Amino acid sequence: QFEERHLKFLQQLGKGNFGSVEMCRYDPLQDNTGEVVAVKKLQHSTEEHLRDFEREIEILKSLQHDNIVKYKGVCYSNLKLIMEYLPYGSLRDYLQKHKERIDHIKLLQYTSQICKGMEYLGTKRYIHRDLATRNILVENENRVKIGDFGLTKVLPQDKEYYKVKEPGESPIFWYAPESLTESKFSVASDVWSFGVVLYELFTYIEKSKSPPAEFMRMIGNDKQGQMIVFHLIELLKNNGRLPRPDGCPDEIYMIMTECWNNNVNQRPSFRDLALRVDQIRDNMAG
Protein backbone atom coordinates (compact mmCIF):
# COMPACT_ATOMS: atom_id res chain seq x y z
CA GLN A 1 0.00 0.00 0.00
CA PHE A 2 0.90 3.68 0.12
CA GLU A 3 2.40 5.13 3.29
CA GLU A 4 1.01 8.37 4.68
CA ARG A 5 4.43 9.86 5.55
CA HIS A 6 5.81 9.48 2.02
CA LEU A 7 2.91 11.28 0.33
CA LYS A 8 3.79 14.91 -0.35
CA PHE A 9 1.07 17.47 -1.05
CA LEU A 10 1.53 19.59 -4.17
CA GLN A 11 -1.84 21.09 -4.94
CA GLN A 12 -5.63 20.81 -4.89
CA LEU A 13 -7.22 19.26 -8.03
CA GLY A 14 -10.96 19.36 -7.46
CA LYS A 15 -13.87 19.10 -5.07
CA GLY A 16 -16.92 17.02 -5.71
CA ASN A 17 -19.82 15.40 -4.02
CA PHE A 18 -18.00 14.86 -0.73
CA GLY A 19 -14.43 14.47 -1.69
CA SER A 20 -11.36 16.23 -2.76
CA VAL A 21 -8.66 15.09 -5.06
CA GLU A 22 -5.14 16.37 -4.53
CA MET A 23 -1.97 16.21 -6.59
CA CYS A 24 0.74 14.51 -4.53
CA ARG A 25 4.22 13.12 -4.98
CA TYR A 26 4.68 9.65 -3.49
CA ASP A 27 8.34 9.81 -2.56
CA PRO A 28 9.20 6.72 -0.43
CA LEU A 29 12.95 7.19 -0.80
CA GLN A 30 12.46 10.89 -0.10
CA ASP A 31 14.92 11.38 -2.94
CA ASN A 32 12.59 13.12 -5.38
CA THR A 33 12.55 10.20 -7.73
CA GLY A 34 8.94 9.33 -6.88
CA GLU A 35 5.90 9.59 -9.17
CA VAL A 36 3.15 12.19 -8.99
CA VAL A 37 -0.28 10.74 -8.25
CA ALA A 38 -3.82 11.85 -7.62
CA VAL A 39 -5.22 11.31 -4.13
CA LYS A 40 -8.92 11.32 -3.33
CA LYS A 41 -10.37 11.62 0.18
CA LEU A 42 -13.68 12.53 1.80
CA GLN A 43 -13.84 16.19 2.61
CA HIS A 44 -15.83 15.32 5.73
CA SER A 45 -15.53 11.75 6.88
CA THR A 46 -18.87 10.25 7.89
CA GLU A 47 -19.45 6.54 8.46
CA GLU A 48 -22.13 6.60 5.77
CA HIS A 49 -19.77 8.31 3.34
CA LEU A 50 -16.91 6.03 4.39
CA ARG A 51 -19.00 2.97 3.50
CA ASP A 52 -19.80 4.54 0.12
CA PHE A 53 -16.14 5.40 -0.41
CA GLU A 54 -15.09 1.84 0.38
CA ARG A 55 -17.52 0.63 -2.27
CA GLU A 56 -16.25 3.23 -4.73
CA ILE A 57 -12.71 2.00 -4.23
CA GLU A 58 -13.78 -1.59 -4.87
CA ILE A 59 -15.64 -0.48 -7.99
CA LEU A 60 -12.58 1.28 -9.40
CA LYS A 61 -10.10 -1.39 -8.85
CA SER A 62 -12.43 -3.99 -10.34
CA LEU A 63 -12.15 -1.86 -13.52
CA GLN A 64 -9.25 -2.19 -15.99
CA HIS A 65 -9.83 -0.43 -19.29
CA ASP A 66 -7.95 2.04 -21.49
CA ASN A 67 -10.67 4.62 -20.94
CA ILE A 68 -11.05 4.36 -17.19
CA VAL A 69 -8.71 6.03 -14.72
CA LYS A 70 -6.19 3.61 -13.21
CA TYR A 71 -6.39 2.52 -9.59
CA LYS A 72 -2.99 2.58 -7.89
CA GLY A 73 -3.79 1.78 -4.26
CA VAL A 74 -5.14 3.04 -0.92
CA CYS A 75 -3.61 4.88 2.01
CA TYR A 76 -4.51 4.09 5.64
CA SER A 77 -3.70 6.02 8.82
CA ASN A 78 -8.75 8.50 7.12
CA LEU A 79 -9.04 6.43 3.94
CA LYS A 80 -7.40 7.75 0.76
CA LEU A 81 -7.78 6.49 -2.83
CA ILE A 82 -4.61 6.68 -4.91
CA MET A 83 -5.13 6.99 -8.66
CA GLU A 84 -2.90 7.74 -11.61
CA TYR A 85 -2.27 11.40 -12.31
CA LEU A 86 -3.58 12.47 -15.72
CA PRO A 87 -1.49 15.56 -16.63
CA TYR A 88 -3.96 17.30 -18.90
CA GLY A 89 -6.72 17.28 -16.28
CA SER A 90 -10.46 17.17 -16.87
CA LEU A 91 -11.85 17.28 -20.40
CA ARG A 92 -14.09 20.19 -19.44
CA ASP A 93 -11.17 22.42 -18.43
CA TYR A 94 -8.96 21.11 -21.24
CA LEU A 95 -11.54 21.76 -23.95
CA GLN A 96 -12.41 25.24 -22.66
CA LYS A 97 -8.73 26.24 -22.71
CA HIS A 98 -7.81 24.47 -25.97
CA LYS A 99 -10.80 25.01 -28.30
CA GLU A 100 -8.57 26.34 -31.05
CA ARG A 101 -6.53 23.11 -30.99
CA ILE A 102 -9.53 20.76 -30.79
CA ASP A 103 -11.66 20.19 -33.88
CA HIS A 104 -14.86 18.20 -34.42
CA ILE A 105 -12.95 15.13 -35.52
CA LYS A 106 -11.15 15.04 -32.19
CA LEU A 107 -14.40 15.65 -30.30
CA LEU A 108 -15.74 12.51 -31.92
CA GLN A 109 -12.57 10.62 -31.03
CA TYR A 110 -13.13 11.52 -27.38
CA THR A 111 -16.84 10.66 -27.76
CA SER A 112 -15.95 7.22 -29.09
CA GLN A 113 -13.58 6.56 -26.19
CA ILE A 114 -16.18 7.59 -23.66
CA CYS A 115 -18.68 5.16 -25.19
CA LYS A 116 -16.26 2.28 -25.10
CA GLY A 117 -15.48 3.03 -21.47
CA MET A 118 -19.20 3.07 -20.71
CA GLU A 119 -19.93 -0.15 -22.63
CA TYR A 120 -17.23 -1.73 -20.47
CA LEU A 121 -19.00 -0.44 -17.35
CA GLY A 122 -22.27 -1.92 -18.48
CA THR A 123 -20.59 -5.27 -19.03
CA LYS A 124 -20.11 -5.36 -15.24
CA ARG A 125 -23.58 -3.94 -14.65
CA TYR A 126 -22.13 -0.73 -13.26
CA ILE A 127 -24.22 2.45 -13.58
CA HIS A 128 -22.00 5.56 -13.50
CA ARG A 129 -24.73 8.05 -12.53
CA ASP A 130 -22.51 11.10 -12.95
CA LEU A 131 -21.29 11.29 -16.54
CA ALA A 132 -20.19 14.81 -17.43
CA THR A 133 -17.06 16.28 -19.01
CA ARG A 134 -15.80 17.38 -15.62
CA ASN A 135 -15.56 13.67 -14.72
CA ILE A 136 -13.62 12.82 -17.87
CA LEU A 137 -9.83 13.15 -17.75
CA VAL A 138 -7.29 13.72 -20.51
CA GLU A 139 -4.20 11.51 -20.62
CA ASN A 140 -2.99 13.12 -23.85
CA GLU A 141 -4.24 14.93 -26.96
CA ASN A 142 -5.58 11.65 -28.38
CA ARG A 143 -6.76 9.80 -25.22
CA VAL A 144 -9.48 10.54 -22.63
CA LYS A 145 -10.63 8.43 -19.68
CA ILE A 146 -13.65 8.28 -17.38
CA GLY A 147 -11.95 9.52 -14.24
CA ASP A 148 -14.31 9.41 -11.28
CA PHE A 149 -16.75 6.86 -9.92
CA GLY A 150 -18.01 8.49 -6.73
CA LEU A 151 -21.69 7.88 -7.53
CA THR A 152 -21.29 4.57 -9.37
CA LYS A 153 -23.62 1.77 -8.35
CA VAL A 154 -23.94 -1.94 -9.16
CA LEU A 155 -27.27 -3.13 -10.52
CA PRO A 156 -29.03 -5.77 -8.45
CA GLN A 157 -29.16 -9.17 -10.19
CA ASP A 158 -32.96 -9.16 -10.65
CA LYS A 159 -33.45 -5.62 -11.92
CA GLU A 160 -32.39 -3.61 -14.97
CA TYR A 161 -32.50 -0.44 -12.81
CA TYR A 162 -31.31 0.93 -9.46
CA LYS A 163 -33.13 3.30 -7.16
CA VAL A 164 -31.26 5.75 -4.99
CA LYS A 165 -31.72 9.23 -3.55
CA GLU A 166 -28.67 10.73 -1.89
CA PRO A 167 -28.68 13.68 0.54
CA GLY A 168 -27.36 16.97 -0.78
CA GLU A 169 -27.22 18.33 -4.32
CA SER A 170 -27.57 16.23 -7.50
CA PRO A 171 -26.47 17.15 -11.04
CA ILE A 172 -30.11 17.44 -12.08
CA PHE A 173 -29.34 19.03 -15.46
CA TRP A 174 -27.57 15.82 -16.51
CA TYR A 175 -30.26 13.54 -15.12
CA ALA A 176 -32.79 11.60 -17.18
CA PRO A 177 -36.50 12.29 -16.50
CA GLU A 178 -37.06 8.99 -14.67
CA SER A 179 -34.05 9.76 -12.48
CA LEU A 180 -35.62 13.08 -11.47
CA THR A 181 -39.13 11.72 -10.95
CA GLU A 182 -38.51 8.15 -9.77
CA SER A 183 -34.85 8.18 -8.73
CA LYS A 184 -34.31 5.38 -11.24
CA PHE A 185 -30.79 4.85 -12.60
CA SER A 186 -29.85 2.44 -15.37
CA VAL A 187 -27.64 2.05 -18.42
CA ALA A 188 -30.35 3.98 -20.28
CA SER A 189 -30.08 6.90 -17.85
CA ASP A 190 -26.30 6.83 -18.38
CA VAL A 191 -27.06 7.09 -22.10
CA TRP A 192 -29.22 10.15 -21.48
CA SER A 193 -26.34 11.74 -19.62
CA PHE A 194 -23.99 10.73 -22.39
CA GLY A 195 -26.15 12.83 -24.69
CA VAL A 196 -25.55 15.83 -22.44
CA VAL A 197 -21.84 15.08 -22.48
CA LEU A 198 -21.96 15.10 -26.28
CA TYR A 199 -23.79 18.45 -26.08
CA GLU A 200 -21.13 19.79 -23.70
CA LEU A 201 -18.30 18.86 -26.03
CA PHE A 202 -19.82 20.58 -29.03
CA THR A 203 -20.51 23.79 -27.09
CA TYR A 204 -16.76 23.83 -26.33
CA ILE A 205 -17.80 24.63 -22.77
CA GLU A 206 -18.96 28.16 -23.56
CA LYS A 207 -20.11 29.51 -20.19
CA SER A 208 -23.52 30.74 -21.33
CA LYS A 209 -24.18 27.48 -23.17
CA SER A 210 -23.85 25.08 -20.25
CA PRO A 211 -26.73 22.71 -19.49
CA PRO A 212 -27.57 24.54 -16.23
CA ALA A 213 -27.56 27.93 -17.95
CA GLU A 214 -29.65 26.73 -20.89
CA PHE A 215 -32.28 24.90 -18.86
CA MET A 216 -32.56 27.75 -16.33
CA ARG A 217 -33.12 30.13 -19.24
CA MET A 218 -35.91 27.83 -20.64
CA ILE A 219 -37.40 27.36 -17.17
CA GLY A 220 -37.02 31.03 -16.36
CA ASN A 221 -34.21 32.52 -14.30
CA ASP A 222 -36.97 34.00 -12.14
CA LYS A 223 -37.28 30.56 -10.69
CA GLN A 224 -37.53 29.42 -7.12
CA GLY A 225 -35.45 26.71 -5.42
CA GLN A 226 -37.28 23.49 -4.58
CA MET A 227 -39.49 24.11 -7.60
CA ILE A 228 -36.57 24.11 -10.03
CA VAL A 229 -36.65 20.32 -10.32
CA PHE A 230 -40.44 20.43 -10.70
CA HIS A 231 -40.20 22.81 -13.63
CA LEU A 232 -37.32 20.87 -15.17
CA ILE A 233 -39.42 17.72 -15.05
CA GLU A 234 -42.28 19.43 -16.85
CA LEU A 235 -40.00 20.94 -19.50
CA LEU A 236 -38.58 17.53 -20.38
CA LYS A 237 -42.08 16.02 -20.31
CA ASN A 238 -43.17 18.45 -23.02
CA ASN A 239 -40.11 17.57 -25.08
CA GLY A 240 -38.17 20.72 -24.22
CA ARG A 241 -34.45 20.14 -24.75
CA LEU A 242 -30.95 21.58 -24.98
CA PRO A 243 -30.51 23.41 -28.31
CA ARG A 244 -28.18 22.31 -31.09
CA PRO A 245 -24.72 23.74 -30.24
CA ASP A 246 -23.29 26.38 -32.58
CA GLY A 247 -21.62 24.66 -35.51
CA CYS A 248 -22.78 21.18 -34.54
CA PRO A 249 -23.47 18.88 -37.52
CA ASP A 250 -27.11 17.84 -37.79
CA GLU A 251 -26.19 14.16 -37.65
CA ILE A 252 -24.39 14.69 -34.33
CA TYR A 253 -27.33 16.58 -32.84
CA MET A 254 -29.57 13.67 -33.78
CA ILE A 255 -27.43 11.35 -31.70
CA MET A 256 -27.99 13.78 -28.85
CA THR A 257 -31.75 13.92 -29.31
CA GLU A 258 -32.01 10.16 -29.59
CA CYS A 259 -30.21 9.79 -26.27
CA TRP A 260 -32.72 12.26 -24.84
CA ASN A 261 -35.74 10.09 -25.47
CA ASN A 262 -38.36 10.15 -22.69
CA ASN A 263 -38.96 6.50 -23.44
CA VAL A 264 -36.21 4.73 -21.56
CA ASN A 265 -36.26 1.67 -23.85
CA GLN A 266 -35.93 3.71 -27.04
CA ARG A 267 -32.51 5.12 -26.19
CA PRO A 268 -29.60 3.65 -28.15
CA SER A 269 -27.06 1.29 -26.62
CA PHE A 270 -23.48 2.42 -25.99
CA ARG A 271 -22.34 -0.17 -28.53
CA ASP A 272 -24.57 1.37 -31.17
CA LEU A 273 -23.54 4.87 -30.21
CA ALA A 274 -19.90 3.92 -30.75
CA LEU A 275 -20.72 2.47 -34.16
CA ARG A 276 -22.64 5.54 -35.29
CA VAL A 277 -19.93 7.88 -34.04
CA ASP A 278 -17.10 5.88 -35.60
CA GLN A 279 -19.05 5.82 -38.86
CA ILE A 280 -19.40 9.58 -38.82
CA ARG A 281 -15.70 9.87 -37.95
CA ASP A 282 -14.74 7.85 -41.04
CA ASN A 283 -17.07 9.88 -43.31
CA MET A 284 -15.35 13.04 -42.04
CA ALA A 285 -11.89 11.60 -42.59
CA GLY A 286 -11.84 10.52 -46.23
Ligand X SMILES: CNC(=O)c1cnc(N)c2cc(-c3ccc(N4CCOCC4)cc3)sc12
Binding-site members are 13-21, 40
Residues binding ligand X: number (CB under 6 A): 19
CA dist., res. 181 & res. 132, Å (int): 20
* Binding letters toward ligand X, positions 56-75, x by CB under 6 A: -------------x------
Contact 27, 6 (CB under 8 A): yes
280 lies in the site for ligand X, by CB under 6 A: no
CA distance 245 to 200: 8
Binding mask 35-54 toward ligand X (x if CB under 6 A, else -) reads: ---x----------------
Catalytic residue among 130, 250, 272, 282: 130
Q: Does 110 bind ligand X (CB under 6 A)?
A: no
Strands 71-75 and 80-84 turn out to be antiparallel
Instruction: Determine the Cα–Cα distance for residues 213 and 221; give it in Å rounded to an integer.
Output: 9
Residue number, 56 or 178, with CB nearest to ligand X: 56
Cα distance between residue 20 and residue 123, in whole Å: 29
282 counts as catalytic: no
Q: Provide the minimum distance between the beta carbon of 138 and ligand X in the complex, in angstroms, as a whole number.
A: 8
Could you tell me where the beta strands, DSSP code E, fall in the chain?
Answer: 7-16, 19-26, 36-42, 71-75, 80-84, 126-127, 136-140, 143-146, 153-154, 162-163, 184-185
Near ligand X in 145-164, by CB under 6 A: 147-148, 150
- 136 touches ligand X by CB under 6 A: no
Closer CB to ligand X, 138 or 280, in the complex: 138
Taking 3-state DSSP, the helix, strand and coil percentages for the chain, each rounded to the nearest 5, stand at 45, 20, 35
83 binds ligand X (CB under 6 A): yes
Binding ligand X (rule: CB under 6 A), the pick from 85, 120, 202, 215 is 85
Q: Residue 25 carries which DSSP code?
A: E
Residues with active-site annotation: 130
* Chain residues that interact with ligand X, rule: CB under 6 A: 13-14, 16-17, 21, 38, 69, 83, 85-87, 89-90, 134-135, 137, 147-148, 150
